[PDB]
Amino acid sequence: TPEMPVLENRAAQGDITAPGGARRLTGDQTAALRDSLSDKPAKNIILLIGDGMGDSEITAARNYAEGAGGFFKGIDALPLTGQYTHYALNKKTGKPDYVTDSAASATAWSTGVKTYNGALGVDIHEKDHPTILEMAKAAGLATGNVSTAELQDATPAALVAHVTSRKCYGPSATSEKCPGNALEKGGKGSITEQLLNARADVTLGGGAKTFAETATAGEWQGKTLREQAQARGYQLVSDAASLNSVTEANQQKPLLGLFADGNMPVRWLGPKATYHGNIDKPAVTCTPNPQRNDSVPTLAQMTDKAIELLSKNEKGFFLQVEGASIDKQDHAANPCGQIGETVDLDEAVQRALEFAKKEGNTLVIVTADHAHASQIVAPDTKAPGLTQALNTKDGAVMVMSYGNSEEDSQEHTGSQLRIAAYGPHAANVVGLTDQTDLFYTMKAALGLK
Amino acid sequence: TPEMPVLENRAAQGDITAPGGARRLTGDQTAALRDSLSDKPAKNIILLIGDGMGDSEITAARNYAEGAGGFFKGIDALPLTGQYTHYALNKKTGKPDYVTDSAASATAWSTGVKTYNGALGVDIHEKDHPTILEMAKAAGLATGNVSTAELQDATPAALVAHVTSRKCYGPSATSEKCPGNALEKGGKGSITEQLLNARADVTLGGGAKTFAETATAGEWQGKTLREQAQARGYQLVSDAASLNSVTEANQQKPLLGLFADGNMPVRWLGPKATYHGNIDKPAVTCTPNPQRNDSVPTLAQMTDKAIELLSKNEKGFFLQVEGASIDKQDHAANPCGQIGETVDLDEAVQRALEFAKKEGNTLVIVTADHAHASQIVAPDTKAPGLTQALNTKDGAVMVMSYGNSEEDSQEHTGSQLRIAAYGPHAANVVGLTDQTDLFYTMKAALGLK
Ligand SMILES: [Mg+2]
Ligand SMILES: [Mg+2]
Numbered sequence: 039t040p041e042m043p044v045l046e047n048r049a050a051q052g053d054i055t056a057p058g059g060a061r062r063l064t065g066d067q068t069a070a071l072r073d074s075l076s077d078k079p080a081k082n083i084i085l086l087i088g089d090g091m092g093d094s095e096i097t098a099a100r101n102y103a104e105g106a107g108g109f110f111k112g113i114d115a116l117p118l119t120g121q122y123t124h125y126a127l128n129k130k131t132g133k134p135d136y137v138t139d140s141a142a143s144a145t146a147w148s149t150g151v152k153t154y155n156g157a158l159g160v161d162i163h164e165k166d167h168p169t170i171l172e173m174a175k176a177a178g179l180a181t182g183n184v185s186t187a188e189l190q191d192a193t194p195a196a197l198v199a200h201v202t203s204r205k206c207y208g209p210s211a212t213s214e215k216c217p218g219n220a221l222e223k224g225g226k227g228s229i230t231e232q233l234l235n236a237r238a239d240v241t242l243g244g245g246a247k248t249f250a251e252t253a254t255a256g257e258w259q260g261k262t263l264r265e266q267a268q269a270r271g272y273q274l275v276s277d278a279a280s281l282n283s284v285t286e287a288n289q290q291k292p293l294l295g296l297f298a299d300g301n302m303p304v305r306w307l308g309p310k311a312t313y314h315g316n317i318d319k320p321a322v323t324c325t326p327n328p329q330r331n332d333s334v335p336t337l338a339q340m341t342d343k344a345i346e347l348l349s350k351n352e353k354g355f356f357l358q359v360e361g362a363s364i365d366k367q368d369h370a371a372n373p374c375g376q377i378g379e380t381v382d383l384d385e386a387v388q389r390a391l392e393f394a395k396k397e398g399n400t401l402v403i404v405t406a407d408h409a410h411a412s413q414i415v416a417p418d419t420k421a422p423g424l425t426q427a428l429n430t431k432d433g434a435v436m437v438m439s440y441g442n443s444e445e446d447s448q449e450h451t452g453s454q455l456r457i458a459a460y461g462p463h464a465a466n467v468v469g470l471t472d473q474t475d476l477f478y479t480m481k482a483a484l485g486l487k
Numbered sequence: 488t489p490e491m492p493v494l495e496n497r498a499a500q501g502d503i504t505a506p507g508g509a510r511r512l513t514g515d516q517t518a519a520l521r522d523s524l525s526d527k528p529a530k531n532i533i534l535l536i537g538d539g540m541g542d543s544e545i546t547a548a549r550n551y552a553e554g555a556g557g558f559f560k561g562i563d564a565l566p567l568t569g570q571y572t573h574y575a576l577n578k579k580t581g582k583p584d585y586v587t588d589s590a591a592s593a594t595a596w597s598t599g600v601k602t603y604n605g606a607l608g609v610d611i612h613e614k615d616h617p618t619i620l621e622m623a624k625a626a627g628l629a630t631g632n633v634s635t636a637e638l639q640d641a642t643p644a645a646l647v648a649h650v651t652s653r654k655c656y657g658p659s660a661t662s663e664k665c666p667g668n669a670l671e672k673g674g675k676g677s678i679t680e681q682l683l684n685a686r687a688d689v690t691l692g693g694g695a696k697t698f699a700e701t702a703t704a705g706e707w708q709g710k711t712l713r714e715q716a717q718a719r720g721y722q723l724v725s726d727a728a729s730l731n732s733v734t735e736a737n738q739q740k741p742l743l744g745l746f747a748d749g750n751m752p753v754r755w756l757g758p759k760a761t762y763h764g765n766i767d768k769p770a771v772t773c774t775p776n777p778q779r780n781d782s783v784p785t786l787a788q789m790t791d792k793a794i795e796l797l798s799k800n801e802k803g804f805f806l807q808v809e810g811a812s813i814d815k816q817d818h819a820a821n822p823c824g825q826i827g828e829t830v831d832l833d834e835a836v837q838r839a840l841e842f843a844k845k846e847g848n849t850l851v852i853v854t855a856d857h858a859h860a861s862q863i864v865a866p867d868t869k870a871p872g873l874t875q876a877l878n879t880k881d882g883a884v885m886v887m888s889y890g891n892s893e894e895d896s897q898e899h900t901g902s903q904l905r906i907a908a909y910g911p912h913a914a915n916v917v918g919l920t921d922q923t924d925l926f927y928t929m930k931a932a933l934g935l936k
């Protein structure tokens with residue numbers, strides 16, 4: 039509908055060296071804003087998560103791929119923007135823990151309650167809390183869970199599982215790590231077991247590896263989780279081709295795609311940032327991954343398939359899309375990997391926006407779980423940590439730094455960060471909010487009880 | 488009668504450990520946002536700058552001072568938010584320079600043109616461009632310029648001075664670094680000298696030192712600039728009581744407050760962050776700076792006095808307020824200084840909002856020139872840089888890290904950052920914009936030609 043608009047052009051108007059040439063706006067937005075506000079109920083919800091995608095990561099990625107005066111057709115097109123907080127809680131004391139992990143953050147938007155790092159779908163008292171997927175499902179809507187990581191990973195895992203520790207991937211690990219959740223100790227089961235129970239109509243991602251573990255107890259005891267899956271009515275697919283065959287997805291024949299043993303492959307490769315790399319070493323240009331594959335769906339691809347199959351439900355749908363790898367490449371101090379996964383996500387955002395634009399009753403939300411390590415610094419910067427200089431699209435050099443861990447892994451950060459939305463109820467992300475608010479915002483737009 | 492609502496309370500609504508207690512919203516925001524949209528003209532403009540105050544610096548200060556679930560009654564209360572980019576240009580190539588200084592950034596917002604780091608009121612070709620202040624004055628509007636740094640520093644300087652280098656504080660430095668601007672070589676002058684010609688109605692801050700230099704030429708050759716200003720009819724005050732006593736400020740009786748030889752005293756004392764400081768050292772608790780004085784007006788005080796004086800103007804006013812020390816103490820790796828300076832800013836913001844709420848035709852802007860070093864990390868972090876643990880309001884420990892420079896100074900950072908606003912034309916800050924767009928936004932809002 040021309041009704042609800044999106045930002046079509048927020049790129050620099052003309053000559054950046056000229057007066058007004060770097061402007062992103064062409065006029066007054068008061069009208070456009072007014073036209074972007076609606077209190078009408080959302081039919082569908084599409085939630086796009088860039089793991090570790092703070093403002094720094096978004097900026098670094100635009101600078102490189104689109105130029106400083108560039109514009110992300112996906113990411114940057116959402117008209118309603120704000121800043122949200124995502125601190126976690128300390129388990130013993132219930133006091134704030136300023137820097138969160140993806141387990142606690144994902145638990146917050148999915149169930150509306152703060153938790154401790156490590157936790158999936160449980161409060162600090164280790165008490166379960168229904169998730170937005172379980173609720174929408176209960177309400178009879180179609181549910182989708184898509185990611186580029188292993189599906190046991192914290193991010194997607196939070197919509198479907200309740201464990202006291204994100205490490206409880208399969209039975210083997212649960213029994214050890216989460217004994218109270220272990221199927222044999224009377225628990226609800228491991229992350230994978232719980233995923234299977236949940237039954238979203240569409241689930242696409244990696245982590246096929248744990249689907250090889252074997253049930254210790256229950257009905258499917260002694261079989262492989264994968265085996266239990268087909269046993270359960272589930273349709274399994276492992277490549278683009280097959281994923282494309284799929285004409286229908288639902289509770290009868292829910293869909294489960296396992297495109298990789300672990301995380302799906304990264305789009306771009308580059309060297310790892312090194313100490314004084316922006317000085318001692320030359321500017322880098324990122325190399326697309328020759329080992330990415332025509333048979334592996336891109337995220338924008340799982341996204342479009344997900345939308346087509348979930349859109350066949352007349353009551354509506356809930357969809358969660360995760361761009362997993364941003365956070366993981368940030369940890370590895372790999373600019374090229376971190377950047378490409380941001381660009382990968384933008385493509386999916388575009389698909390989601392396109393659908394919402396025409397559909398008209400769709401709420402699209404784009405955000406991150408927490409902030410990361412990456413910073414953009416001056417080119418002649420002499421940093422204590424890991425640095426790298428990059429040749430951007432503007433023909434200039436950009437330098438990225440990761441200086442918050444002497445360890446082998448760059449740490450997350452607690453800075454508040456961008457949240458953007460388009461469609462009905464999107465005004466609920468404007469200004470300062472908390473990660474938990476997102477739950478109530480979503481459940482409220484759909485009218486979930 | 489606040490036609491347009493400001494956000495009265497977005498602190499966590501209840502018990503942070505319980506379902507929905509960490510929420511900052513109490514309901515749907517649609518109607519309130521709708522109520523924040525107006526395209527009526529703006530009588531006045533109050534622009535508040537926290538130098539180097541990125542989203543990280545804000546989060547950090549809130550956690551410390553108000554708690555994670557806290558809310559800055561000033562800073563966090565502006566209902567229309569977005570993110571803005573502030574890259575500068577490379578003088579020679581004209582290509583983007585990812586990390587700006589304060590000089591080129593304030594030039595951006597004050598003239599609508601991008602320029603090279605170090606430049607004030609001039610473009611890459613060193614051409615001069617009229618400033619939003621000079622233009623307001625020209626239209627008959629009352630003008631103000633308040634800052635906690637020396638008045639010759641880039642932020643305030645940019646509004647009334649045009650020079651090739653930011654270093655050109657007074658006659659002596661200008662002759663050496665800005666030979667083209669030097670009074671004696673037929674130039675327009677040094678920063679202080681043009682500041683004096685600019686004749687803003689209200690100018691309050693530090694930098695008294697440079698006023699002890701003597702003109703090298705012109706009508707006031709051989710007299711100090713202090714005398715020249717007295718000679719030119721400026722009202723000079725240097726203490727809080729002298730300032731309070733002021734009843735008038737206009738083109739006839741311009742006001743000049745010089746409250747510190749250099750920069751004004753910082754609000755809180757604390758030790759410098761250090762290597763492995765969060766491990767090898769006990770947690771720090773900020774303490775008020777005894778020097779902060781009673782003879783010294785605070786940022787909130789000057790902001791109040793300036794609005795009073797400026798408000799007298801029928802046509803209206805444009806006022807810039809700078810919390811300068813946030814950036815400075817960030818370069819210094821001093822969390823208490825940095826945070827204290829952000830708290831100071833919040834108080835100045837509250838004053839501006841109170842008046843604006845009242846007046847009804849005032850546009851209030853809160854943003855920063857660029858991003859900075861500061862990162863919030865896990866308590867157990869083992870960082871290559873400077874860290875420090877802090878005892879927050881929540882009775883918990885927060886660790887701050889500075890790791891982008893092996894130099895004495897920590898660096899500015901390239902990330903886009905929060906921009907927020909309240910009042911008529913406030914919508915122009917939502918979504919993604921450029922710093923230069925702000926120039927155009929204040930121009931149209933005040934109806935300038
Ligand atoms: Mg993730
Ligand atoms: Mg400044």
Ligand SMILES: [Zn+2]
Pocket residue numbers: 089090139140365407408
């Ligand atoms: Zn994460």
Ligand SMILES: [Zn+2]
Pocket residue numbers: 539589814815818899
């Ligand atoms: Zn600075």
